[PDB]
Subunit: 493 residues, 4 copies
Amino acid sequence: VPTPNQQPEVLYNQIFINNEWHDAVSKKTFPTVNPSTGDVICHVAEGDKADVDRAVKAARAAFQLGSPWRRMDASERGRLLNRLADLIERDRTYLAALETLDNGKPYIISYLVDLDMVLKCLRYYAGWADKYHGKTIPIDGDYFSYTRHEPVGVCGQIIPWNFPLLMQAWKLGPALATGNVVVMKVAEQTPLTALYVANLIKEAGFPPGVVNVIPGFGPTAGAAIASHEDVDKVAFTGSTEVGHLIQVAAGKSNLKRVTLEIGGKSPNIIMSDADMDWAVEQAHFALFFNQGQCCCAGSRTFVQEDIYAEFVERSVARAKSRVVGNPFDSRTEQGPQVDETQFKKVLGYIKSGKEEGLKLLCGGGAAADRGYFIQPTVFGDLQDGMTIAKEEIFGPVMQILKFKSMEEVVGRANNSKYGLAAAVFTKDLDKANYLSQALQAGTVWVNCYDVFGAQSPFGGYKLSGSGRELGEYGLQAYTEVKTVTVRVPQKNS
Amino acid sequence: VPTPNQQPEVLYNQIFINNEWHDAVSKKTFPTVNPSTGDVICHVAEGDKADVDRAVKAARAAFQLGSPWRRMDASERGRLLNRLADLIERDRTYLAALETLDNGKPYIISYLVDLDMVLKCLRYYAGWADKYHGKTIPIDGDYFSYTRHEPVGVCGQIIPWNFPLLMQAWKLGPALATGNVVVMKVAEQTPLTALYVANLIKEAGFPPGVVNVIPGFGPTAGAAIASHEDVDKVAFTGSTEVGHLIQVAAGKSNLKRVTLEIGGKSPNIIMSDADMDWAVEQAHFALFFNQGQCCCAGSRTFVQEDIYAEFVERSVARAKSRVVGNPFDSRTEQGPQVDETQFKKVLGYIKSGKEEGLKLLCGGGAAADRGYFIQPTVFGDLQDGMTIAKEEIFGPVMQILKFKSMEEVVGRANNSKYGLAAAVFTKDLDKANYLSQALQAGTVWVNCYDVFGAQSPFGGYKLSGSGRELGEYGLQAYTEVKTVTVRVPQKNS
Amino acid sequence: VPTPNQQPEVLYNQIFINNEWHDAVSKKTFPTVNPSTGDVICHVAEGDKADVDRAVKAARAAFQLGSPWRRMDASERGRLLNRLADLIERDRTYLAALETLDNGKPYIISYLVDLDMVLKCLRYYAGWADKYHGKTIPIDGDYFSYTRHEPVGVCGQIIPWNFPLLMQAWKLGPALATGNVVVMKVAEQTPLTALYVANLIKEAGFPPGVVNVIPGFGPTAGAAIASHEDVDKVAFTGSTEVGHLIQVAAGKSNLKRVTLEIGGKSPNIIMSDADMDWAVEQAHFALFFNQGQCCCAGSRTFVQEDIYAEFVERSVARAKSRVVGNPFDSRTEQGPQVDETQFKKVLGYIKSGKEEGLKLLCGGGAAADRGYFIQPTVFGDLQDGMTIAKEEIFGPVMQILKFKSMEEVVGRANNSKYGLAAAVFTKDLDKANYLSQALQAGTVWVNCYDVFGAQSPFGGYKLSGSGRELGEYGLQAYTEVKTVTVRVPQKNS
Amino acid sequence: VPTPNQQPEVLYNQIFINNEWHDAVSKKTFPTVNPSTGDVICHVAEGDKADVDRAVKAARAAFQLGSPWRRMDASERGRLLNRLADLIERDRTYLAALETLDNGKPYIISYLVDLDMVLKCLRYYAGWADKYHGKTIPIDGDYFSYTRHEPVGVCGQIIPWNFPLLMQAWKLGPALATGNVVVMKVAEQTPLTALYVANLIKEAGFPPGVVNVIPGFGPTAGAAIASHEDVDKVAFTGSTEVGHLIQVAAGKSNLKRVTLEIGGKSPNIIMSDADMDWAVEQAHFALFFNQGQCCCAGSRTFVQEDIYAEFVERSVARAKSRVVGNPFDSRTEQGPQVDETQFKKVLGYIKSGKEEGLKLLCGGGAAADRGYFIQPTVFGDLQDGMTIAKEEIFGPVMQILKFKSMEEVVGRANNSKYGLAAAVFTKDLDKANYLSQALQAGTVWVNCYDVFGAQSPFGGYKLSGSGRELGEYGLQAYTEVKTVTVRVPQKNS
């Protein structure tokens, strides 16, 4: 991993529309802070409805029948996405550093993890461009019926702050590969990286209006996209709470297609025959990865009584050794929480746990007085009715529960409004197969956690989502099907 | 076509839950009238939220992991659907008669069209049961990734009164084929046939709770389903106005998956090179089919100026010969409108057209003093800004517009909030191919209209829908995708 | 299981062509014996080249563009296959008895196993008829490209005597479902059941020439089909030796498509952690099922040394209790071998094993002096270089080998010219996953054996086959793809 | 188009095996001539059986379970193919010049056509690498069945001299994308370009033994591949005559999977309503493209009598203006024929035509006395029984036939042992649709010819092929399907 620039230059901080950078119509700007120091990095244009409106306008024009983008060969769409990937890889060190500066995650992670997964996603979707075929259907009668898989049109894509570059990649990959146009709203907590990539999109040679990125606020620029009368589809990734607002907004206006990737409270089930060493480490990772700021975090670690005590002791030790510090330091495992608000939220949950009557095994408090650092907390002897066992904490706060039977763990694990992911650690073939089938979750990992593949779909089962985001599935929501039934003189097989 | 019983006996008029018939919790009942005579056929149990909750409870139980339905082989689901089909064919004469008695459509149509289409739908989806495979994905790293296409769960399905039996079949086919459970709300205007089939479901051997049919009202039983906290998915077919309510209800509650098949104002484009005879008859059919009560009716007949006068003359003559009368009479082409409310609504539009300044060429008034018969009306010299040229009439009221160029007709045809279907009549290959691509419609018929195939998807492009209902596509909405990623010792190709 | 007729009446014994029965052009006939008594059941017309030529002509005519069969709706093809199924189910008892009479397998098996699987196969492919879509391809340039999945044409299908009715169904299901025409060559050892079904094909309403069944001899009628200049595809199931002849014949003449389902020497690997009881019973079934006359029989039972002794002991006991006798007797587990030739071949192998220096644990000799009964033989302490450990025996002769490591068992099990199937018994997830990937077999069963599903493909990896026979894959070989590229005025997404 | 080097340097002329260049075991070499001058360009190592044997050895080793290539992520296979493309694009000018030097085709074509198509093919298949999923199948019983799409293994790929780089690309694309290993035999008449690309494969980072290219002769190196006991699959592109040999070879030995892309006599049907200008130009292109050395050439131009005379005179004029000359000259439309042998063959056919009694409209003789140039010949008034109207000429010799009805032209056009491609020129929708369905051809072009898309399959219907080469279909033949059926505690939907 190349040595990063601990203070990477901010080159873009405006609104990107027709491959052009401009200030908000209001000339208003908002600050973007560095979670590690609490100091302001710079100021970014604050997009609002007026800016969304013009971006939508730009996108619609780019999507007109006869446009360079609509006339473009699917293969060329693939070429553009691969070119974009190349530019991102060329600027990998810079983007990794900026990602960390704006977000807080360890540089090594932004480089080896975030950026690699960003490149793999775009590279993956580049190949789908000319392969998502329609169908020729053996309909009854003397007809020739077939389907066209056309773009759904103008897509509003709202993304969170936990994986800035990756979330952007997950949206643009399938949308662009299918021929759609994008009006994207990026998180006000982390707008810098998305904007830089927006310029690379221009450099890649994408036609104007195809991708418009608008930095701003949620109830402001986000809501304007969700309720716009000319946005054909919305893709939102964030809280279930806001997820509700997105669907409600869609219904109250355009009846635009909606997909949601939202919260979670994922159960990580360790069976007594599981390899302790692997299970403990993976359990640690399952919850602590990315400052605990992952929607599919294993926030409910169910451990079989027979091995509970040992598993708990080992988890606490591992939590005790987890290095929290400067993201740019090679030995830093944990950076700060994205912002003060989240910092307080997490702390509020730790307080709740202690008050609910939970066994605090690892220090649950601030880890520093400068950035938003919190100590890797671990709560043992957790009860299902406890707030921290029910509500998504989104911080470095581990919950460890105890169970006896499979029948019991299935019911407990499944008894949640969420269903984003789950995990099973066991050496037994039958337990693995039984559980993976019984678990009501979009993804079930067996003997592993947080394993993402651009080729494998991801999504929620209940109030944790709607629709899937990767693989071939990720193309479905960005496709509008048209049936064309032509009358023929005489149909033959 | 066998001789029908002009007065078929009503055997079921209650609420169907766990394969059992019972009155509404309130014991309240509502009348179902015969549109031909205006007299009450009988009374049906009026389901409400209390009944909906009971049905959902029943359905959820039937969906329990380990249930006969969930443990059932996919092939067996296919066998049950085929058995159902057989029972409907056994009772084809009776059902065609009852369909007409409660709806008003001609008996010949109910028999040869509706029932045939019903049988073909179920028979088609019966074969999909064991064929909608998941995937084994070549994910990165030492893992074995694959997806499971599981049922979405408890599905709420709300259907209209235009095609009682068929609408029911379009919903049950894909749902049952996939392993889902149903809580269906039937149109209060036409609940009889759906209830009869509900009993056939029981007789076919479907496990209790798998299909629950609730007769009742919209804002009552319908809304109860749309905002239910335990319904995983909603499939609604009706007005766009209500469609909005369904999507808003889903967002404000459960975040349940939603699909909508709604209104339309489909354009029927006749090019100057089209075969007049065919074009004229097909245009007649395109709009007048089923008392004009079809979501995909060719409500806007655009005819190229060069052949406009001739086409109009021929249209009016054909409309003047259209026989309106007793649905059970062999020579009846048009029966009455479903009910007085729709009778008045259609008349209101005829009034509107005359006042908008439209050329009434065919008598626009009631055709009788007993049932809800309206005369096949034809309006010539229509203008895009005219109410009847923008709002869905849902009655035997034809609109004929005049155009010159293709660029012109595409823009005009496309300039609508709707996009359910469209049609183009021409002998030219390039115009056919150009137009089918340019028209923003879920279905584009070329040299034909109203051609439906159980194997070809159907749906709307704008405020006329979301999702497709037939073919393989119809299975998508009834499937929940689960990704299972297993860590393996050493992955190889 | 209904009481069978020990002496079922033979109603059809001639050549079936245009839905008509006639004697061979030579008037020659051959006898069909009853393996249980060694007595002649009756005589069947002996088809030859002249008869094959006539059949091919009939088939070709039925395949003419514009034929009732080619113009028929795909759904109707489905209907015919379901009708056929129903007729077979109606005559289930008769067919099961006749199957046993002519083949030797126990009636219970013929009824509950063979017939059920025949019904399931036809009923399964009936549903594929109108679902095997082609595709609309996003090709470069201003074009509309799409593919048609047309029938391959006239298909020659040659089947064996081990599962008469079943093998017939495996060929007809996919062929007919895709719109092809068939010229079938049935095994001289067991032509009876296939002939009766041929008449059911007539009764089902299949167009004349669509299915022609020709009873006769291999180098006679079989070779005539394989080398015919007007047969578009050949599907052969039998010995690898003859498989070679089919491929060579195809090349020396028509260059017709070829698919082969041939011999095997499947390894059944029992890991030390396997459940003894289950593993022992399944191992017994794996090899002894259908008088050991199954191409995917577990001919090489590799058992982990730690559990070898015990496994062997249990295997011998189970083989010693295996009831051999009258197929019509409820307690008979094993009937006779198909005929004297096979009877002597199996005996020759037992002799070989004894001479090779193998430990005969179970009596290896004739079990009676009337029919072709052989005692369930079990050879312990087998060595890979032994003939019975290399050549397919096709009889009730079990081989039990000893192994130590997984690396060793993989190499040993894979060290064969065959690769039809394999099995792995273990409770460990990793071993299951590892082995199933490492084994070069068309089918790898884990914790079970001989599990067939009409929905899952089956075939060989080396000299044991080419192509797969069930599921969606089974339709591939019966499809000819046509690409139609149309120049369009302006292509858009 | 950049200025080429009229004399590009030959850097590789040996056998490429484990990413290493070596002389044949025999030290024998053969000359490669320049068709334009008749002079020897250089000498190339003459591979033989011994060289094929070692190449297969290398390939097998590269295919061992646990190999870098087998363990490699499918996505990485995609990366390698994209890298290879980049290298080819980097060297596009050199490769196009060398292609023309050794082949004879005009440099502008090699550059703008051949190399573009080469890049597009590899770029296309690079995206398929991680998307050709297997399936999870809803089999009956308590099991989990799924399929694995594994590589077929060692693939022997034999290619022709008409499109050296492109044929190589059509083979390597699908093979490598699927994870197979290759032993390729390149045409003795044109081995240079294929060898240079072989080195780029090394530079790209492909693991040793994955692609082995062997220059040599047909009955020598080609036959050794076709009958090799360790080659799992053979892919051959060439004459139907040799095609027979490949299939017979496969049967006589390994029973290896075979696919054939062979000869043709494609009919180009011009209906009276066709746009003459376009039809005439396209007709010229259809047959004259690449010195008439294309298997899909429109060898039989059927013209409707009403427009026959005009079409004929227009064709002759166009043929009279076709510039034949130095391939490197910007004005050259036609270069020389690949070699003296082909030179003589084509001339022999012209002689035949004259003798069969055909109307020679354009000079049918040599165009120069240096290279292998032949004058663009046009034969009018041809009859179906004439040799030139039956046998593939593979030279600039056009055949123009006259027809009256559609019924007539379908039968005549279809009356051939070949069925590679066909074309229909008409403005009529019904004629287009009717003919496309009626024509027994692997590809039917409507109002265009020789339109190839890496995304759409290509192949023959009779003695012109077996299997398809492009699109998703091209992956089928390079995949071996394995079914894994696991016993599960309790199967649920």
